[PDB]
Design a protein around this ligand. Structure first.
Ligand code: HEM
Ligand code: HEM
Ligand code: HEM
Ligand code: HEM
Lengths: 147, 143, 147, 143
């Protein structure tokens, strides 16, 4: 939708600092810890029954990286997000049936993790702003089919 | 929080709709599965496809309404009186909290649909506050 | 999106029984009563400070009818809902800023009012189903711009 | 509900972040207005356009965090200790409950952003549970 150069810049610039394999694992791990009902969706990850089980489980770390790769797909196609997320929508919302609001929760956890990594001087109100408009779009593109 | 007034309104409604609860619960559950298919994922062990006509659902219908009838009876301490349903839902089954809203809606829908003259605006407020408080008690064992 | 004849039928058939000027007022009135924070948006309706004020206020009844006319616009354009709601989206979500979840709340109250009017033998699980897929679409088409 | 453990975790965090609350609140409020413009509708009386740099917001920042510091101090009865903020928010201003989630997020975001080493997964859980409980106490006077 309407992205400005200022927005693309801030977002691209931020995705470019982020180390996917580090923020991804931490984010997906927090989702599972802080909001434990999300665990029901990853029954195929094995041992995630305790918080240390979770923090150590390599399958969780692996999947956290897949999520960041999924986000990269959008940062790479910022003007067609909805169409390029054609598959991820269907999977999550037509097959798995993740309640929409969980997308927001993981979106928030990543932002928070992005925050704790870079600080208030890189993750400024201005960046934070472009970034949030970005996740709001991803979130919207991820859901649908359930209703 | 439920006020004493709120409790008094829920009590008058429940006493009035009791008995018919069994059909109301069959209806409520039966409608959630059909109208909000995302909820069916929690009942995939059940057989025939899930509507009011399947036995499992019609029997589980009376079940929920029985628990709800019991919540009304302990309206002064839903937390304490609901800790086992919470451990079952929030801990054992890992139900997404977002679904409590769905069942509640289908329940209020059924009530208004059965006792319309009695589900006045003020009652609708209290019964909605109660169901919201019920979900809160059930979300107790999540984290 | 994908509407079947069975769905269009049930929906059209139901909208055709409904008396807009009767369900509308009751629905908008309940919204204001049951979820009082929605009152902040209708400050121009005058006296709605008490539940009887609300139930009697003609401005509330008038507006409830405008809401049902807005829904008729969708029942009339079921395959372009999103585009025909181009204006209502902007108003509610870009100008007024009604939190999205309120759309769902009014959607639920109307359904409930539709329910109390017709009963379980007209508002069957089958109808209730087509109807819900319908409101889910309206709700989605009404919001956006806020994020 | 907050468990004693939860309370103990919120207490350790708060004691640690106190003082800096004033800048954290300025930041939190400043970020909500900018990142979630739908919230600005509640502050249209304020002047300069709303960011962390405007005085009204930076001063109201310390204000919220002061109330939050006070909530922590009455963590055993947020309802009773928060009834006046609730009457103000839920009754006087008619704030949409859906916004409490927004402020909370911006607050946790600021905390993690300022005391990252201290906002571990377990803390994040409790502080989120507390903020959720806070909103519940403030939603007390809605209906
Ligand atoms: C920022 C939001 C999210 C993004 C971008 C995202 C991305 C992804 C990606 C890239 C995949 C791989 C898809 C494929 O197989 O083609 C995936 C799969 C999956 N995601 Fe997500 N996801 C998000 C949020 C969530 C949430 C909140 C949940 C859970 C509550 C969830 C549950 C799953 C599940 C269960 C799978 C497949 C796993 C399995 O079969 O065990 N996702 N996601
Ligand atoms: C908020 C109101 C709810 C109440 C009063 C309620 C009540 C109950 C009761 C009384 C039982 C039977 C327990 C037993 O056999 O020991 C139960 C079980 C269960 N509930 Fe809930 N429930 C509620 C919400 C939900 C929701 C929102 C879902 C998810 C869509 C759900 C999913 C389940 C499942 C999957 C079972 C186990 C069923 C089986 O296979 O026997 N419940 N619930
Ligand atoms: C089924 C969902 C809804 C529909 C179809 C709907 C429809 C309408 C329609 C047709 C209008 C007239 C628009 C125009 O001026 O062109 C309108 C205006 C308005 N609606 Fe909605 N609406 C819905 C939900 C809501 C909710 C939930 C709120 C409040 C929480 C809301 C607040 C308003 C306001 C404030 C106005 C303009 C009023 C004024 O200036 O005083 N609407 N709506
Ligand atoms: C959930 C956490 C919240 C806390 C701890 C909090 C705390 C406070 C405090 C301490 C005051 C100052 C009261 C006074 O001057 O007497 C206040 C006022 C106010 N709050 Fe909140 N607040 C919260 C959430 C919100 C939210 C979600 C909004 C809406 C976006 C909001 C809107 C307002 C407004 C509009 C005022 C009056 C401001 C003025 O013009 O002076 N607050 N709040």
């Amino acid at each position: 939708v309407d992205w400005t150069d200022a927005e693309r810049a801030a977002i691209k610039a931020l995705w470019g600092k982020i180390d996917v394999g580090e923020i991804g694992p931490q984010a997906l791990s927090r989702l599972l810890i802080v909001y434990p009902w999300t665990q029901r969706h990853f029954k195929g990850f094995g041992n995630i029954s305790t918080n240390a089980a979770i923090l150590g489980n390599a399958k969780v770390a692996e999947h956290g990286k897949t999520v960041m790769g999924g986000l990269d797909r959008a940062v790479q196609n910022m003007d067609n997000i909805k169409n390029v997320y054609k598959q991820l929508s269907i999977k999550h919302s037509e097959k798995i049936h993740v309640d929409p609001d969980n997308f927001r929760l993981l979106g928030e956890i990543i932002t928070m993790c992005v925050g704790a990594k870079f600080g208030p001087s890189a993750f400024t109100p201005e960046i934070h702003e472009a970034w949030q408009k970005f996740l709001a779009v991803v979130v919207s593109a991820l859901g649908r089919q359930y209703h | 929080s439920l006020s004493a007034t709120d409790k008094a309104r829920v009590k008058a409604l429940w006493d009035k709709i009791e008995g018919k609860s069994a059909e109301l619960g069959a209806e409520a559950l039966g409608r959630m599965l059909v109208s909000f298919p995302q909820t069916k994922i929690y009942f995939s062990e059940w057989g025939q496809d899930l509507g009011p006509q399947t036995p499992q659902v019609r029997n589980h219908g009376a079940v929920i309404m029985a628990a709800v009838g019991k919540a009304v009876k302990s309206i002064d301490n839903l937390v304490g009186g609901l800790s086992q349903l919470s451990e079952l839902h929030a801990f054992k089954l890992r139900v997404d909290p977002a679904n409590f809203k769905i069942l509640a809606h289908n329940i209020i829908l059924v009530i208004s649909m059965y006792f319309p003259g009695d589900f006045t605006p003020e009652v609708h407020l209290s019964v909605d506050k109660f169901l919201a408080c019920l979900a809160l008690a059930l979300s107790e064992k999540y984290r």
